[PDB]
Amino acid sequence: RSCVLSVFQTILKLVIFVAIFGAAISSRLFAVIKFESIIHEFDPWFNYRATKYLVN
Amino acid sequence: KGFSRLELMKQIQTQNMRQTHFVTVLDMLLPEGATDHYFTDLVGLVSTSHAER
Amino acid sequence: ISDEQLNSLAITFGIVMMTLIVIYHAVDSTMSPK
């Protein structure tokens, strides 16, 4: 009984994390598939200018 | 003398010739059945381009 | 991909993640000490 219930809890939690790791990913992406994929604003264009220096 | 915009708007407004010496459209010829075109750039993705047969 | 299909994919993942919580908490509430 204890093994059956514990296995049920484990498999159901795995399916929960597979769904809720996916709902976030699909909610963030309207500005990427609507338009092109570029950095957005004033302040995040220094950070991209610095991690392109470190990277090469 | 420079580059004035409104004089180019006056050229676009009254058009009778293709005898001008600057380039506005250009078209390459492709193989027979071509499928997934794109025309990107060095700063982004230019969105003014449409295919023909 | 048109964002109508992205819209239906978003609410679909929301409802499928949000319904199974309740049956998890119902099994865990009924057949457990606390």
Curated annotation (Swiss-Prot), chain A:
Transmembrane segments: 5-26
Span(s) of short sequence motif DXD motif 1: 41-43
Glycosylated sites: N56
Site (described: Interacts with target acceptor peptide in protein substrate): D43
Domain free text: Despite low primary sequence conservation between eukaryotic catalytic subunits and bacterial and archaeal single subunit OSTs (ssOST), structural comparison revealed several common motifs at spatially equivalent positions, like the DXD motif 1 on the external loop 1 and the DXD motif 2 on the external loop 2 involved in binding of the metal ion cofactor and the carboxamide group of the acceptor asparagine, the conserved Glu residue of the TIXE/SVSE motif on the external loop 5 involved in catalysis, as well as the WWDYG and the DK/MI motifs in the globular domain that define the binding pocket for the +2 Ser/Thr of the acceptor sequon.
Family: Belongs to the STT3 family.
Protein name according to UniProt: Dolichyl-diphosphooligosaccharide--protein glycosyltransferase subunit STT3
Gene name of this polypeptide: STT3
Residue window of the full protein shown: 5 to 60 of 718
Swiss-Prot record, chain B:
Sections of the chain in a coiled coil: none
Cellular localisation: Endoplasmic reticulum membrane
Paired cysteines (S-S): none
Family: Belongs to the OST1 family.
Quaternary structure and partners: Component of the oligosaccharyltransferase (OST) complex, which appears to exist in two assemblies comprising OST1, OST2, OST4, OST5, STT3, SWP1, WPB1, and either OST3 or OST6. OST assembly occurs through the formation of 3 subcomplexes. Subcomplex 1 contains OST1 and OST5, subcomplex 2 contains STT3, OST3, and OST4, and subcomplex 3 contains OST2, WBP1, and SWP1. Interacts with SEC61, SBH1 and SSS1.
Other facts noted in the record for this chain: Present with 11900 molecules/cell in log phase SD medium.
Described function: Subunit of the oligosaccharyl transferase (OST) complex that catalyzes the initial transfer of a defined glycan (Glc(3)Man(9)GlcNAc(2) in eukaryotes) from the lipid carrier dolichol-pyrophosphate to an asparagine residue within an Asn-X-Ser/Thr consensus motif in nascent polypeptide chains, the first step in protein N-glycosylation. N-glycosylation occurs cotranslationally and the complex associates with the Sec61 complex at the channel-forming translocon complex that mediates protein translocation across the endoplasmic reticulum (ER). All subunits are required for a maximal enzyme activity.
The name this protein goes by in its record: Dolichyl-diphosphooligosaccharide--protein glycosyltransferase subunit 1
Originating organism: Saccharomyces cerevisiae (strain ATCC 204508 / S288c) (Baker's yeast)
Lineage: Eukaryota, Fungi, Dikarya, Ascomycota, Saccharomycotina
UniProt gene name: OST1
From Swiss-Prot, chain C:
Effect of T19D: Severe growth defect
One of the GO BP terms on file: protein N-linked glycosylation
Keywords (A to Z) from UniProt: Endoplasmic reticulum, Membrane, Signal-anchor, Transmembrane, Transmembrane helix
GO cellular component entries: endoplasmic reticulum membrane; mitochondrion; oligosaccharyltransferase complex
Topological type in the membrane: Single-pass type III membrane protein
Keyword Lipoprotein assigned: no
Pfam families for the chain: Ost4 (PF10215)
Cytoplasmic side: 28-34
Coiled-coil regions, chain positions: none
Outcome of mutating L20K: Abolishes interaction with OST3 and STT3; disrupts interaction between OST3 and STT3
Bilayer-spanning residue ranges: 9-27
Lumenal side: 1-8
UniProt-reported outcome of changing I23K: Disrupts interaction between OST3 and STT3
Subcellular location: Endoplasmic reticulum membrane
Any one GO MF annotation of this record: protein-macromolecule adaptor activity
Pathway annotation from the record: Protein modification; protein glycosylation
Effect of Y24D: Severe growth defect
Subunit-level organization: Component of the oligosaccharyltransferase (OST) complex, which appears to exist in two assemblies comprising OST1, OST2, OST4, OST5, STT3, SWP1, WPB1, and either OST3 or OST6. OST assembly occurs through the formation of 3 subcomplexes. Subcomplex 1 contains OST1 and OST5, subcomplex 2 contains STT3, OST3, and OST4, and subcomplex 3 contains OST2, WBP1, and SWP1. Interacts with SEC61, SBH1 and SSS1.
Cited function: Subunit of the oligosaccharyl transferase (OST) complex that catalyzes the initial transfer of a defined glycan (Glc(3)Man(9)GlcNAc(2) in eukaryotes) from the lipid carrier dolichol-pyrophosphate to an asparagine residue within an Asn-X-Ser/Thr consensus motif in nascent polypeptide chains, the first step in protein N-glycosylation. N-glycosylation occurs cotranslationally and the complex associates with the Sec61 complex at the channel-forming translocon complex that mediates protein translocation across the endoplasmic reticulum (ER). All subunits are required for a maximal enzyme activity.
Miscellaneous comment in the UniProt entry for this protein: Present with 2430 molecules/cell in log phase SD medium.
Family: Belongs to the OST4 family.
